[PDB]
Amino acid sequence: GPEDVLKFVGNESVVDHFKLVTKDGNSLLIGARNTVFNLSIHDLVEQQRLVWTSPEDDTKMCLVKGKDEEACQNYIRIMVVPSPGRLFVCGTNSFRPMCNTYNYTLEATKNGQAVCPYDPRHNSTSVLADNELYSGTVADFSGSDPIIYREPLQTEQYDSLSLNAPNFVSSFTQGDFVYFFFRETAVEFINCGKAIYSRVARVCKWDKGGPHRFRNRWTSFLKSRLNCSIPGDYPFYFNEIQSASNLVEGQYGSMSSKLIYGVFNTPSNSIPGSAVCAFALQDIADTFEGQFKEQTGINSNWLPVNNAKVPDPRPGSCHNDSRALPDPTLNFIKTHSLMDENVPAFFSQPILVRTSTIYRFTQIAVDAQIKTPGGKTYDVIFVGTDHGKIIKSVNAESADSADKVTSVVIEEIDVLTKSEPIRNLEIVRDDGKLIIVTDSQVVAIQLHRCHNDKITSCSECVALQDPYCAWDKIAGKCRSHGAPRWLEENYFYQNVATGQHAACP
Amino acid sequence: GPEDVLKFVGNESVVDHFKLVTKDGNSLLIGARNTVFNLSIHDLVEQQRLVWTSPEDDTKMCLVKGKDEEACQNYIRIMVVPSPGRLFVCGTNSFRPMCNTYNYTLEATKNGQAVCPYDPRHNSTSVLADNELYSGTVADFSGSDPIIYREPLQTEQYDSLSLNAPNFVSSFTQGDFVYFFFRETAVEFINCGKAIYSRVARVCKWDKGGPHRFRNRWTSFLKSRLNCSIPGDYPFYFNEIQSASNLVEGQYGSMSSKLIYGVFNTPSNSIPGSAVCAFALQDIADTFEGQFKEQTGINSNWLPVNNAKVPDPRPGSCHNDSRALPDPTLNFIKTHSLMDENVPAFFSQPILVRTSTIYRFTQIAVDAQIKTPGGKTYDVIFVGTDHGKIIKSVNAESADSADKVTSVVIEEIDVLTKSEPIRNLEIVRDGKLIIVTDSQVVAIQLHRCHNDKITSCSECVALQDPYCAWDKIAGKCRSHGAPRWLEENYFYQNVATGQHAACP
Numbered sequence A: 001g002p003e004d005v006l007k008f009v010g011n012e013s014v015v016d017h018f019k020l021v022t023k024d025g026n027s028l029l030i031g032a033r034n035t036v037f038n039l040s041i042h043d044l045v046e047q048q049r050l051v052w053t054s055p056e057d058d059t060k061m062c063l064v065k066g067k068d069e070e071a072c073q074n075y076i077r078i079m080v081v082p083s084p085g086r087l088f089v090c091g092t093n094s095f096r097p098m099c100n101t102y103n104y105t106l107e108a109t110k111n112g113q114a115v116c117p118y119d120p121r122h123n124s125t126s127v128l129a130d131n132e133l134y135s136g137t138v139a140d141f142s143g144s145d146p147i148i149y150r151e152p153l154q155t156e157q158y159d160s161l162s163l164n165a166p167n168f169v170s171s172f173t174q175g176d177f178v179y180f181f182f183r184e185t186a187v188e189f190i191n192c193g194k195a196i197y198s199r200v201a202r203v204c205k206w207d208k209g210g211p212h213r214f215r216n217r218w219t220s221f222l223k224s225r226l227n228c229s230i231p232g233d234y235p236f237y238f239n240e241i242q243s244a245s246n247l248v249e250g251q252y253g254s255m256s257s258k259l260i261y262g263v264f265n266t267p268s269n270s271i272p273g274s275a276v277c278a279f280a281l282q283d284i285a286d287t288f289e290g291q292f293k294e295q296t297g298i299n300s301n302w303l304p305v306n307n308a309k310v311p312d313p314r315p316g317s318c319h320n321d322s323r324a325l326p327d328p329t330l331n332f333i334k335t336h337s338l339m340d341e342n343v344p345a346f347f348s349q350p351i352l353v354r355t356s357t358i359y360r361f362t363q364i365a366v367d368a369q370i371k372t373p374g375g376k377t378y379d380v381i382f383v384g385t386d387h388g389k390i391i392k393s394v395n396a397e398s399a400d401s402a403d404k405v406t407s408v409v410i411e412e413i414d415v416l417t418k419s420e421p422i423r424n425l426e427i428v429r430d431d432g433k434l435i436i437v438t439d440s441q442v443v444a445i446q447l448h449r450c451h452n453d454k455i456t457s458c459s460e461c462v463a464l465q466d467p468y469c470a471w472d473k474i475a476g477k478c479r480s481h482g483a484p485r486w487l488e489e490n491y492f493y494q495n496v497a498t499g500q501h502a503a504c505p
Numbered sequence B: 001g002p003e004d005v006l007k008f009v010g011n012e013s014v015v016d017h018f019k020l021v022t023k024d025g026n027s028l029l030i031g032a033r034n035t036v037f038n039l040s041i042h043d044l045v046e047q048q049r050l051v052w053t054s055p056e057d058d059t060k061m062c063l064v065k066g067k068d069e070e071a072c073q074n075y076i077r078i079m080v081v082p083s084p085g086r087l088f089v090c091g092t093n094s095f096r097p098m099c100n101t102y103n104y105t106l107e108a109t110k111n112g113q114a115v116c117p118y119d120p121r122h123n124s125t126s127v128l129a130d131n132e133l134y135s136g137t138v139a140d141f142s143g144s145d146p147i148i149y150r151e152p153l154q155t156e157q158y159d160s161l162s163l164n165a166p167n168f169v170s171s172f173t174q175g176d177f178v179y180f181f182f183r184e185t186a187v188e189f190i191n192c193g194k195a196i197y198s199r200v201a202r203v204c205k206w207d208k209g210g211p212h213r214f215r216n217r218w219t220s221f222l223k224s225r226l227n228c229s230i231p232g233d234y235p236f237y238f239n240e241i242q243s244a245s246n247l248v249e250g251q252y253g254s255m256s257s258k259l260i261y262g263v264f265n266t267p268s269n270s271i272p273g274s275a276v277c278a279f280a281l282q283d284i285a286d287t288f289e290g291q292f293k294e295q296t297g298i299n300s301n302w303l304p305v306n307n308a309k310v311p312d313p314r315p316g317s318c319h320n321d322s323r324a325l326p327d328p329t330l331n332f333i334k335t336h337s338l339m340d341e342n343v344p345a346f347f348s349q350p351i352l353v354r355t356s357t358i359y360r361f362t363q364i365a366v367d368a369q370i371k372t373p374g375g376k377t378y379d380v381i382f383v384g385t386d387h388g389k390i391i392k393s394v395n396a397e398s399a400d401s402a403d404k405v406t407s408v409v410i411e412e413i414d415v416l417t418k419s420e421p422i423r424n425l426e427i428v429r430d431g432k433l434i435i436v437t438d439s440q441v442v443a444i445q446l447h448r449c450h451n452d453k454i455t456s457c458s459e460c461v462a463l464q465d466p467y468c469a470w471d472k473i474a475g476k477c478r479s480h481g482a483p484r485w486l487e488e489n490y491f492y493q494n495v496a497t498g499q500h501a502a503c504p
Ligand SMILES: *[C@@H]1O[C@H](CO)[C@@H](O[C@@H]2O[C@H](CO)[C@@H](O)[C@H](O)[C@H]2NC(C)=O)[C@H](O)[C@H]1NC(C)=O
Pocket: A022, A025, A026, A027, A028, A029, A038, A039, A047, A048
């Protein structure tokens, strides 16, 4: 396959999953089980190492004979950089999650309940704000009560209408609003059957509490389904979600191209077919302004909610005083938290689909829109699989009656061992490279293979349709973008679905 | 692939689909569009041909500008042999289905409403009885009213609770009870979403009608869902059904192995994964004896039906007098026709599954249980695909904590052109196979123990085919049903019996 530009076999069984990239500090804090590493983004050289050995009393309490000797240790899952500049790492610590703030300077330690999972399963995510941290994970030992913990607010205890077996995969903040991505079991569909529908949620930044003992509960909690289907005469849906990328902004704000890419796939019972579905923050806000989904009982009968029922205060909005908000809508928000309509997919079709293959998508990574010689900018997608095979892709919009979108599969070359599954991905923003955080090791390879790829044929650059690729006449080098600088404006031919028959022959 | 033992390219565009096998008469009546053929089973030689040219007045009424010049003609779909020996064929006749009772001797011609489909779509099936004919097809021109017509009873006009967009794929009779196989849209799940669940139905032999305006309607109509899923921690279902084989009986009646093999697959929107699920008449009768599925309204609320609601007369049973049956159960049968529980799959697992491949299962054929040298008898499965690839398979029962059946895929060799899809299969009782397709029908041997020569002993031993057997002094690979042994001999076979090696 591809030559290993940088390989890093740090640990045998620690199975790193978490990572933080700070380009100004120029250091990569890769989270890990029972260990922490600080490397340089240039050559993957560890600067310092924080090793946290779970106390003896904590490990001695965990004696489940099933599957604990290799596991049930310190799984450092969440980490952010607070405003004072402190170090904030929290581990599971053998089902005893307690956050320890930090260098080995222990500034303070606080209980890590509802911010670090008890199980080592990938079912939690976190994101920071200016003053508070947003984390969604389970609360009890078994994990039956999964809540969102912003200090010190909690949702309704054992509320299935809000959360029922979710797997938080993403979380980001935009304009005093923190969004969450998870796959929970829909209570309304349980009447029909057992299935999981990807539902996005959002909460305001400053929710102080609620009046009349509602101080613990949330007031503006809302959620709505994500519709990731292959449109046509009959819709074919994708139930489960595995990952979701960060928000994408293009050029000025006048453009409405705010795009969020999420990795979706088919449930366990069904075939390993996976699909990359895009969702916009504008498409998300369309359903939240819409009405809520109806919820009736066994005896009482109710019709889909109408506009007469909505109160004067609008649900899901940042107010200056949340406690002064009236109660009739606070008794109303719990029953009608879920929305009626699902968020439509971008351009009414998924971005990338892979059905016949055995492997399933597991992670995702998005690169910035580079300036292609065609005078346009499109988004780049990097999606990993449990097989370990990485797929590079870019998208051009094609006009058709069914809005057929061409899924450009640049190269499907596998980089790591077939056995190990990719569990986290990241792109570096100095030299072009890629981060593939897996259980066995993390390997850094170049982002685009326009350079270092030579089949001794001119056609290689032209046939791939890669945005970074470009060919020169007097020189035999296949040009790239971001690494070389042109002395003056030149001619570069590219075929990003532009309709070019041939060039090299 | 395999050499064409018998070739038969009868027609380029007639697209034959129907066939009737009579072993005593030794003739194969293969039904066809605008033609019908009566052949010999030995060498596929047509004895006589009846050509039925749709009348001019009938064809002139059919002027569908989309795609009719090639279609909208005489599609002979149903045919049985009545007791007098007459010929009873009915064709679509350009959306004018009129049955022709019979050689060209036309004894009588009667309207074929509710027994022959108007459309050329494969959505109807038929089966004969001692005195009446059982047929399930649409009634109107568009096809919105599909009913089951045994002369002269009809279901409720435009009844969605009983039938909603069905595709009748099979129909057979057993003990004064005629069962039907079709894939209709479930009204209760339509509330949740658009999906098709395979539902089997049955009707008694002698239902004259019902009193107090129920004379038109059926009294003993019942149906229940078919569960064709891959069991485990989470069930994965197969929604649509494409075909279903005839009943299988093994040795004496004391054994409970009466099984019907049906071909199932995944809806159109989802992936082409198909599954062959077996269902027993004993498993069918378990759900019909069970309670009925509840059906409530928008305002009224109802709980799942209980045993207190069932009347003293048992629904779905042959009575001596159907008119004397009370009315409170006749007003009850329509609302609660569907059963609550679905028919479980045989051994709680499908027989054969094909998911990763692009081709979909289209038909099915079951061979009789031959006597293998291992002292046992198992069923043989032949399932065709839209790709044209034919797969022969047999299944042996394996004991484990988790029910897992090994699906023996004997040979997956393609016989016909990749383009054409198989649309009907049948086995002959010399060992051969009949592959009725749109382009042509090809007759090839049933088992490939003979006519297969890789010059290696290991080929034969590895196949695990029941008909295959090897000899020591002679290099011939023995078969069953064609050669006769002079005396008892030794034959080694490994139908999942646990044999490491033999030839090397
Ligand atoms: C990771 O290691 C780097 C490399 O030492 C740290 O960055 C330096 O830290 C020292 C000590 O605080 C400072 O004096 C330097 O100014 C930092 N920058 C450079 C370029 O040396 C970094 O603080 C460590 N931690 C993280 C989270 O990045």
